Amino acid sequence: YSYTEKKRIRKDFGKRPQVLDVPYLLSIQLDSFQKFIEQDPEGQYGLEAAFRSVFPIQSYSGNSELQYVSYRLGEPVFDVQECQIRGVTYSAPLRVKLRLVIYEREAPEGTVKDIKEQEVYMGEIPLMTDNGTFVINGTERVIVSQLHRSPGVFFDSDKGKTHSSGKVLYNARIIPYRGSWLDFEFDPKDNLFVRIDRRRKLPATIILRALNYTTEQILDLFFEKVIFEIRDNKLQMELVPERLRGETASFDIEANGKVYVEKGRRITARHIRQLEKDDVKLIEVPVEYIAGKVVAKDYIDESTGELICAANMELSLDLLAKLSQSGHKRIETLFTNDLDHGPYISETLRVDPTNDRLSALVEIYRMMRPGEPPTREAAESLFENLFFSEDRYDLSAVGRMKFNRSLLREEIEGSGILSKDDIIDVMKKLIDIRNGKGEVDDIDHLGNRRIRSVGEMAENQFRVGLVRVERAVKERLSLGDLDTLMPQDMINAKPISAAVKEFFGSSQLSQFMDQNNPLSEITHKRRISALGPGGLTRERAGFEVRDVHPTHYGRVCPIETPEGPNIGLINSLSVYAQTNEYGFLETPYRKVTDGVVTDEIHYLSAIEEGNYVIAQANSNLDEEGHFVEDLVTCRSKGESSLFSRDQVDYMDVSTQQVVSVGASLIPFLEHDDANRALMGANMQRQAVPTLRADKPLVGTGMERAVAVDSGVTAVAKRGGVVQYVDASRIVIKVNEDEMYPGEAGIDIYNLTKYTRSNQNTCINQMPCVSLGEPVERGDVLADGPSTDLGELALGQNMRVAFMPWNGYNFEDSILVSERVVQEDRFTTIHIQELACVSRDTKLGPEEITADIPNVGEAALSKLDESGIVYIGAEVTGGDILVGKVTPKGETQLTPEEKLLRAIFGEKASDVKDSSLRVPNGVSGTVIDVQVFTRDGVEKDKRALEIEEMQLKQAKKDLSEELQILEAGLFSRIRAVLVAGGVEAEKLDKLPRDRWLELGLTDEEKQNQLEQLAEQYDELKHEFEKKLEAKRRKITQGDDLAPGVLKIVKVYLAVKRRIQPGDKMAGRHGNKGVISKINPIEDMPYDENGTPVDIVLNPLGVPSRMNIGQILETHLGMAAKGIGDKINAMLKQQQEVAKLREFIQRAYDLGADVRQKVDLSTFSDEEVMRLAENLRKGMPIATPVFDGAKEAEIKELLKLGDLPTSGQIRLYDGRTGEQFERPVTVGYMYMLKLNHLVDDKMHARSTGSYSLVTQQPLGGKAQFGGQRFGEMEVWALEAYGAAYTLQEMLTVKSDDVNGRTKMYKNIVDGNHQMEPGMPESFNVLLKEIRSLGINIELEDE
Amino acid sequence: GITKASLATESFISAASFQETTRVLTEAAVAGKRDELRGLKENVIVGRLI
Amino acid sequence: LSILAIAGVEPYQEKPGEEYMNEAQLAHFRRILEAWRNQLRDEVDRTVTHMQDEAANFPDPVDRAAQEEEFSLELRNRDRERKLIKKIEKTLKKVEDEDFGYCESCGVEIGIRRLEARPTADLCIDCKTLAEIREKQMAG
Amino acid sequence: VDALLDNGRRGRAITGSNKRPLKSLADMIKGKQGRFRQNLLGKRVDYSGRSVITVGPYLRLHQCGLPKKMALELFKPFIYGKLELRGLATTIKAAKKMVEREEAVVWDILDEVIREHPVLLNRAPTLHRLGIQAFEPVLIEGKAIQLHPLVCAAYNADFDGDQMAVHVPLTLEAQLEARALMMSTNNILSPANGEPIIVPSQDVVLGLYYMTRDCVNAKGEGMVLTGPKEAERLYRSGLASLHARVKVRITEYEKDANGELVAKTSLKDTTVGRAILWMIVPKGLPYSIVNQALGKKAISKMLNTCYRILGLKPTVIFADQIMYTGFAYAARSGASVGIDDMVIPEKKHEIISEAEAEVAEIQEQFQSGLVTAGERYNKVIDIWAAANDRVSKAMMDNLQTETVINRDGQEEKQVSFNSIYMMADSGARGSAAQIRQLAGMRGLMAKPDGSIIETPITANFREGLNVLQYFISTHGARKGLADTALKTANSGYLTRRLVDVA
Ligand SMILES: [Mg+2]
Ligand SMILES: [Zn+2]
């Protein structure tokens, strides 16, 4: 048992043992990017891969070739923190080595010279954080992994709804990784067609003609031959004994001197058995059956040299006579069977307007590029570039794999572009399914959906970056002089860095990290989307792809998906899921060999899994690990049934592996309706972090995994003991085993302190260890926000009781006791960033001076002499944060203003008042001021005080490092010097700096002291440079936008408590809007007097079948019972014996669990610290499907000395009388979501108006009025509200003149309206009148 | 049918609200059509009493 | 099958050379078919009666999606039961007439023990399965 | 020229340096759909705001709880007016500074301008004219809007965090318009079907039901009291049980004359609850209307008859009293819900083993190709489909009546007083449909196909579900949400077409 587990241990119900612990949840993000940016000395996906494809680039046959050597990644210009404050993207410079070779003219190749240009720079490429995010402009962003149709070929339907005939249709689609789509589709007439992209449909055979296949070769390929001999006179026929199945006799069919079947009897198993056993090879026939048959090849007249019949032409009873007299013994025909092998391609040829190769190559060119004439060079080049150019086409490896797979080939890798064979084999297979042999795919199956993620998608954006620079490089290499241009003159920087900046900056897949919550971050980074580039569109598909598919089991979560306009279009990654080498979705399983269940695990992709028969999660195995029952519920090929003991090939890994990280955090989930469960794990991520990190009384076990794997916490790199603990930093003196040989020293973890998050919430780390405590590798060193002691605590549990409280929980509304707001426990800390910009306008420069026209000293009190607000000043609405003035000269004031200025002697300023002031209603504490100044504009007074303080602070921090690092390093020197010369007292009198001289007798210890010497002088020198760059970065001109001189960013820390309007919900999809805040005096209490914190409405539970919220409340009730029990015994100071005796009883409970526990833990110093941590309640774990059962919950109620009902009688705090009936009370973990009221509440009387349409518009954040759309007008029309409507869309909005006539009237106290015409309509009149239309207003 | 019935409206302004606007004006502008208001939609458009 | 248990009938004791149509056997199978038809008719009536109480009592907006979901399943189901009754009735005409017991596609005879299992069987095991295969192929 | 007028009836001339095509004059009128300005939305509107909505049962039906902060900014020109009318401000510029200073003097002024001045409340999809209603505003410390609970039914508002908008009727006309047409009390009947739309919703109906209900034997059985006035006195002091069979003297009225009130006094056989309740019902109604059990259905028919006999005014104030009281007794009752409320039949596992062998029967016939394959699917699907109707009407007999209790003599059983039952029978929340998924097993689900799956959910919510059972429950849930997502779009288009032709 570990170190931060010994502190507080979650009682775990649930029987199935955990065999594989949840892996790093951020695997995907970190893994994928690492592959992209990394040296791979071969083609495997990466930056290397993209290069080797396009390179070598070669000039226009000029034998001037530019080849690709290798590439490097420069060090980050700013690190994570630095880059964030300033607003740069966190990027590294890409330096790539290029070699320019020139071939003599004319050359059996080899070079006159080659200049080996060192690393040209092509932009900076962003870098990923330690936790899988990017920084794009000082703002953390996430790149959502994508789901798109796997490359390969897929045969599809379009059954039913097509044409209102039924019939169905069948289509094939060849979807390559890069290059044009190739679609093959039928139609009602059973004609085969092809279309490139979604373009014009064309008769399928046209491409065969383009591959130099004529009519004869087209027939030979897709059809068999029926050979007709003219032997003696009039017609014999070669018979295949199988061909006659599914048809009826056409005449008297006889052979071998015996009539097997007569006219009119369908040829069945009887007739074919006779022919096959009697060996009937050749039969004589009548001349009329060939009246319909189609001739295969070309047959010409040997005498006249004329064409008798062209290939694919139907014969007649007279045409045969014409080629019989010409001496033709053979006539080859097509095998046509409308049950087995249908005459499809034949009819297409009769619909094909082309005949030769250039005919089709033109018809292809004119389809792609209509309007312009076809050419020989045009048609040939276009088609060769479509599916046969290494440059313009690639299936990738995945494409080649699924392609060959679906066609039942052997090779798993081959060509990267399509061949004449590939296309034919595909055309063949499409026909086969229509014939009844073979089945179609479905898009939804996770073997035909592939997952790409940042590493791959960036590759494509670099690839597109190169293809548009390649044209440019080829162009310069055309005219280029001798030894003057070098491989840098041609390659520009902006084109490469822009094509990648485009992506991370604005993209459907690049978004602001959902960071209000350690769960929110981790649930975002594990997210899928079928939208955007290469995927489906919301307006396209279409319920089949949105709906949950059988293949999601153990790969994609079935329940965590958004609840909006794109349901099922997102999904979230399952716990144990991982991405296949080829990019499919695989899941872990357990190898069941014969009748024993092993623990050796196998990863099975979506295609791999179907074949096997997989057992179930909940399966009882005992002793060696045989299945206990002779029959076990299992699922095999897409379905589920009972199976024999030794038929199961694998078994589920965990009871959990089907859900997501979000879904797994709900306790007693099994008992919750699927609808409400979705809402539960949907709202869990919206949990704003609380003031005091609680801990869930009712847990599942996953909470520790989510806390650690999300970055918010500080996890010990190396095990050791704590030397120094600060709210700022934590220093760990490493143990000897893990400590590296040289440099010795200590690991020092600097904590993140109060700072703005993406959602204006606060992200603050706190130390969770004490001075000199033992920690092991991978221990929790400091809690993030809404995490405690290593567990994920998204909220605070409280005493909750289900009962009507005079209607103050009418719908799902929540009723909260004052005890909560007094305890400041749902109080929530927010950090807003407000910025002031000194710009440059045409009239002049803006000054940040504190000289502000027409303001009293009352303002400039909270402002320093320079004009910036002091740190620490608690301000409210209206207070000025940064005084600012803009040049606005010669106001041109009116008569009465001049006299007023003259009466009171105000110096009507030549500068406008533009200062940044605090938005009305929001109020908080200033906790930080930043100043960013143009390079070359003078730093004002306060700006220099700041940049002076940052300097003094940075030196103290860095020097603290060296001071701690020296003593840490010197402490090892002291101990190795003791090994062969130990003079304990003699050594430490003299100056420690005067130690380096002391040597050692012949031994490796002399070579070890040599090691510590090296790493000493580097700390000495590495200090200097770290101080230099740090110092330059502060003073260096901070770069801003054009037109902007200097910027002041103030960071506010507003502390918002909790009030009616805030949305809150438990984890079970029970929303509710807090309605009244009651006195503890008025709360329902029990005979012990203890009030209850929240009074929820019982009606919300039966309707919405979220029954887990009840189980949670009861288990929570029992969990607090153990707490109150220990709290009494802990206050009694009973002694270790009585305490340990009671706790031990709790952790077993009934029998059969997985928990295990003491007495190993040191029966004193360790045991005592634990008891404290439990008195608030005993943390229990209900795994997802391995959860606790009613008996175990009720059993823990007995141990807590609490009623088994989970209900008690209560007394109304107002009347003091009893409540009839027992009511349920218990503890339910509850979240406060950030739909906080004082963010939603807006109001506007008269504000700014939009320029184009004089219409209320949010401009100064006094937001626009409510929009009064079409439907709200029908409302007034249904009433008689004729005037209410007029005023609504006249004076209240659009009537530029009416609004002021009204406002003036309002204060004069005359409620009237002088309406006139809405400007919205006046512009239509002008807009109409500026077209050719004479639109007037008639009459009077 | 309801959808077709609405397509015929005496007031051309009402039609350019929910029908295809380009077609309505052209068809109406060549005809020299006079709109007398009378209906609801249009009086709301032009902002006088329903 | 609990079908034989509900009634006081015991598995039929087919004798060695036992025929197929005597007074006692058709009187025996007529009763079973009539009793079977009468039970389904009572089931269809009970279904319709339950559905109307839901149609008469109005649920609250929140439980409407759950009531609507459950109302649709019964309706679909109800229509399925009505088809089955027509199928048994069709089978009752085959007993009375003289064209019961053989595959409709090929003249092959359908098994005796097989017909006691599914008296509504129209095809032999060979022909029926191929039809399901074409089905999955002609449809999807 | 052509790209200027309507670009798109050519090749689509693109804008400078920007790939996107440039928007022409015709495209400045056209849109999605038609004229943007008249299309939702729809023009933004001065004097307005919004926030999250909450409850407030203390309201009279003609009022609503409006945040102090909002009302100040909203009526700003009105306050500026009344302030200098009474002489509290030298000039408007001072008035601006006064309300900016939030001087306490202004609150007393605001209360003047607020009194007889209605505001308009509007909630998300405005579906019928009852989607906007006019209330009289009451000042609130807090940032949420307080919404009288009875209108929550009409709005299809729940409290899952929904927000509503406010609108100030400015002109004198708009005030008199909002008061005589859009006011709460003027619209209590739905214009679609004459029945009350201000029907008691859920919490409030659960109240009266528990109240006007009787159990076999409890304190107060059979005694007699002078009238309802002294019937209440008996309960509040713990001498009588709310539900005990009791004769009391009542006086009902009946206007059976020519619009004239006739009085009748009688010794009715009732319970204490129904006794207490009659003190609300105004004059001319018969005591018969409150003598029954009062479920959601009967509770609204009662309100209705009050309208069609006494008129608007008495019904309004009546309806208020119902709400105040319904909420109150629900609280006294201490009604709740725990795990032990969802009583599973003792016979459940029995029912299973029968249908489990029946499926084992239809399997036996399938085995090595006896009977065809597709038959077996639909054979089994039938033997499952029956058992759910068996389990349902099994638990429903146990859940319904099994409170077995005795009156002085031997034994007796009556409608259960179990918590979860009372809710559905009354109509407060949940339906026999939903109960069937809490206690009995929850039906069969169907795969994405629509083709119902041959192994139903054999577990219920009081039990756990296992891996597969939840995974099967998934499809119906997602398609369920998906569907109702579309049922929003379909309604919207249907109603839109209908008003265009009307
Ligand atoms: Mg809502
Ligand atoms: Zn057959």
From Swiss-Prot, chain A:
Q: Could you state what the record's PTM comment says about this protein?
A: Acetylated on several lysine residues in the presence of glucose.
Use in biotech settings: Co-administration of salinamide and rifampicin or salinamide and myxopyronin suppresses the emergence of resistance to both antibiotics.
Q: Pfam families from the xrefs?
A: RNA_pol_Rpb2_1, RNA_pol_Rpb2_2, RNA_pol_Rpb2_3, RNA_pol_Rpb2_45, RNA_pol_Rpb2_6, RNA_pol_Rpb2_7
For this protein, the record's SUPFAM superfamilies field holds: beta and beta-prime subunits of DNA dependent RNA-polymerase
Quote one Gene Ontology molecular function term.
ribonucleoside binding
* A GO cellular component annotation in the UniProt record: transcription elongation factor complex
Q: Which domain of life is it from?
A: Bacteria
Record-listed N6-acetyllysine modification sites: K1020, K1198
Query: Does the record's keyword annotation contain Acetylation?
Result: yes
One of the GO biological process terms: nitrate assimilation
Q: InterPro entries, per this entry?
A: DNA-dir_RNA_pol_bsu_ext_1_sf, DNA-dir_RNA_pol_bsu_external_1, DNA-dir_RNA_pol_su2, DNA-dir_RNAP_su2_dom, DNA-dir_RNAP_su2_hyb_sf, RNA_pol_bsu_bac, RNA_pol_bsu_CS, RNA_pol_bsu_protrusion
Phenotype when changing D673 to A/G: Resistant to antibiotics salinamide A and B
The outcome of changing I567S is: Resistant to antibiotics salinamide A and B
Keywords (A to Z) from UniProt: Acetylation, Antibiotic resistance, DNA-directed RNA polymerase, Nucleotidyltransferase, Transcription, Transferase
Described by its record, this protein's role is as follows:
DNA-dependent RNA polymerase (RNAP) catalyzes the transcription of DNA into RNA using the four ribonucleoside triphosphates as substrates.
Q: Which family does it belong to?
A: Belongs to the RNA polymerase beta chain family.
Q: Which HAMAP family match?
A: RNApol_bact_RpoB (MF_01321)
Q: What is this protein called?
A: DNA-directed RNA polymerase subunit beta
Query: Which organism encodes this protein?
Result: Escherichia coli (strain K12)
Curated annotation (Swiss-Prot), chain B:
Concerning biotechnological or industrial application, the UniProt entry reports: Co-administration of salinamide and rifampicin or salinamide and myxopyronin suppresses the emergence of resistance to both antibiotics.
Post-translational modification (record): Acetylated on several lysine residues in the presence of glucose.
The subunit field of the Swiss-Prot or TrEMBL record says: The RNAP catalytic core consists of 2 alpha, 1 beta, 1 beta' and 1 omega subunit. When a sigma factor is associated with the core the holoenzyme is formed, which can initiate transcription. The rRNA transcription and antitermination complex (rrnTAC) consists of RNAP, NusA, NusB, NusE (rpsJ), NusG, SubB, ribosomal protein S4, DNA and precursor rRNA; S4 is more flexible than other subunits.
Per the similarity annotation, which family is this? Answer: Belongs to the RNA polymerase beta' chain family.
Report the protein's function: DNA-dependent RNA polymerase (RNAP) catalyzes the transcription of DNA into RNA using the four ribonucleoside triphosphates as substrates. Resistance to the antibiotics salinamide A, salinamide B, rifampicin, streptolydigin, CBR703, myxopyronin, and lipiarmycin can result from mutations in this protein.
Q: What is this protein called?
A: DNA-directed RNA polymerase subunit beta'
Organism the protein comes from = Escherichia coli (strain K12)
Q: Which residues of the full protein are shown?
A: 1308 to 1357 of 1407
Curated annotation (Swiss-Prot), chain C:
For this record, the Gene Ontology CC terms, alphabetical, are: cytoplasm; cytosol
Q: Report the InterPro entries cross-referenced here.
A: DksA_N (IPR048489), DksA_RNA_pol-bd (IPR012784), DnaK_N (IPR037187), Znf_C4-type_bac (IPR020460), Znf_DskA_TraR (IPR000962), Znf_DskA_TraR_CS (IPR020458)
Q: Which GO terms describe its molecular function?
A: guanosine tetraphosphate binding; zinc ion binding
- Top-level lineage group: Bacteria
Positions bound to Zn(2+): C103, C106, C124, C127
PROSITE patterns (alphabetical): ZF_DKSA_1 (PS01102), ZF_DKSA_2 (PS51128)
Which SUPFAM superfamilies does the UniProt entry name for this protein? DnaK suppressor protein DksA, alpha-hairpin domain, Glucocorticoid receptor-like (DNA-binding domain)
Please describe what this protein does. Transcription factor that acts by binding directly to the RNA polymerase (RNAP). Required for negative regulation of rRNA expression and positive regulation of several amino acid biosynthesis promoters. Also required for regulation of fis expression. Binding to RNAP disrupts interaction of RNAP with DNA, inhibits formation of initiation complexes, and amplifies effects of ppGpp and the initiating NTP on rRNA transcription. Inhibits transcript elongation, exonucleolytic RNA cleavage and pyrophosphorolysis, and increases intrinsic termination.
Q: What is this protein called?
A: RNA polymerase-binding transcription factor DksA
- The record lists the organism as Escherichia coli (strain K12)
Write the gene name. Answer: dksA
